[PDB]
């Protein structure tokens, strides 16, 4: 027989290094949503993302979601590099009831929610971070979308706000979209998260007049990006295999397989349904 049809009922943790995301997908793991602390500093050859994962913080959406998810997985680690950001006058460390950690209103531990000061002042912020290191940085920032024009001025004074992140060769500017949206986790407002890669020797500028979900640092980007992600509900067992599918690992010398199109590693070439001999 030349087509392997039997897979293991588990995912082999050897020799490939697997990391179980459990209640967090790879996106909330980068943002630092509640429950995503077990991924801090983790390194993986294959990130195992569970379909049963749930959102545990502010309702958000990511323009070009699959690109950031691929960048986070292809990197293969969660090495945060905290940085001090000299925000002037504005309030910091905003917390929300839809992001309750230990029944305490919290937020993404990698993001900083900037609000207007108690003196009703949200001045222009123009901070600059220079990448004078030997590695590429990955900054993740967000833009808050309130529900009403009253919420916009109550949080950031200025209406409309504006978020503008720029590098030496690129610039992304966003104006908040206001409007009551469907109730998600007790909130009609949403946050749109973005990312920007800063090469060594390049600069990045965070310029805002309101609605900025500021980052608390950046992630290290490996020079070699060799890892990947696998979304499956199959548990991790104790077998030994260098082949993995969304239905389980495979141990075979056969040259073909009719199990799953999604395969990672030392895996036989997938074929359509059916299987015969020679």
């Amino acid at each position, epitope marked *: 027989e*030349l*087509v392997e049809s039997q897979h293991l009922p588990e995912l082999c943790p050897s020799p490939l290094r697997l990391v179980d995301g459990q209640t967090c997908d790879i996106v909330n793991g980068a943002l630092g949503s509640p429950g995503c602390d077990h991924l801090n500093g983790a390194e993986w050859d294959i990130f195992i993302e569970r379909p049963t994962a749930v959102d545990t913080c502010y309702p958000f959406d990511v323009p070009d979601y699959q690109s950031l998810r691929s960048i986070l997985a292809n990197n293969g680690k969660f090495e945060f590099i905290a940085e001090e950001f000299q925000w002037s006058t504005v309030k910091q460390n905003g917390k929300s009831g839809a992001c309750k950690r230990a029944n305490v209103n919290d937020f993404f531990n990698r993001l900083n929610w900037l609000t207007k000061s108690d003196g009703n002042a949200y001045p222009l912020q123009n901070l600059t971070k220079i990448n004078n290191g030997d590695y590429a940085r990955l900054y993740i920032w967000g833009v808050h979308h309130p529900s009403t024009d009253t919420e916009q001025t109550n949080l950031y004074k200025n209406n409309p706000g504006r978020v503008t992140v720029s590098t030496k060769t690129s610039q992304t500017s966003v104006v908040p979209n206001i409007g009551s949206r469907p109730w998600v986790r007790g909130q009609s407002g949403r946050i749109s998260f973005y990312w920007t890669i800063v090469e060594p020797g390049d600069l990045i500028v965070f310029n805002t007049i309101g609605n900025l979900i500021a980052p608390r640092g950046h992630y290290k980007l490996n020079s070699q990006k060799k890892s990947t992600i696998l979304n499956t509900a199959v548990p991790i067992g104790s077998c030994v295999s*260098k082949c993995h599918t969304d239905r389980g690992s495979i141990t075979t010398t056969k*040259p*073909f397989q009719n199990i799953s*199109r999604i395969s990672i*590693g*030392d*895996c*036989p*070439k*997938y*074929v*359509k*349904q*059916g*299987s*015969l001999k*020679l």
Partner: antibody
Amino acid sequence: EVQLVQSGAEVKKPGASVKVSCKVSGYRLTALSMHWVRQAPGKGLEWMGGFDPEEDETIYAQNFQGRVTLTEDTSTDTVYMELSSLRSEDTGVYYCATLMGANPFDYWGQGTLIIVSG
Amino acid sequence: DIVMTQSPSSLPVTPGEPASISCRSSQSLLHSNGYNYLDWYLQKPGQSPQLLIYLGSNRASGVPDRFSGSGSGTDFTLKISRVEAEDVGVYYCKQALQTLYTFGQGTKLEIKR
């Protein structure tokens, strides 16, 4: 064994559109990846397109300028190849085959000669 | 695209004598499985293509034992121990790694004269 039967010869004046058939007997097309390779007379084999099990999408060779149109009828177990904008260089034998790179099998058809001269 | 450069182009061979056709690719055709995804086809005169060697060196179904293959990576070779009149035609090597299959130019097998 799987039997691939191609439609009879077709002669269409230049600028028309052909429609070649390939009926599979001995295996469901629902479990087979079909491909297409033409050979100009006195020359060599040229891959035109087919189906990739992975990615799960009929991939057409861009060298044919998207003129190829691969449709499959799962009820009759027949693959259809439609080449539009016929020119004087599109004359030759057109094969349908379940190539080895996609399926564990490797069977071919008799060929459907297409003469473009009007 | 991966380029296949078969050599030679014309292979006159005396019957009852061996022969060799080298098929050289432009990229490594060795998957992590160790399975070199390259096949050898033979198009007999006025005949549809037929398979001779599959997966690098494994002989296809019903193929006589005189045929044989070898090679790995970007260098492969098809061989026949005792060529006969049943072996005339043009041989092509495929490329199964990338599903965008790219055949070779083909080597014609004439009888030495």
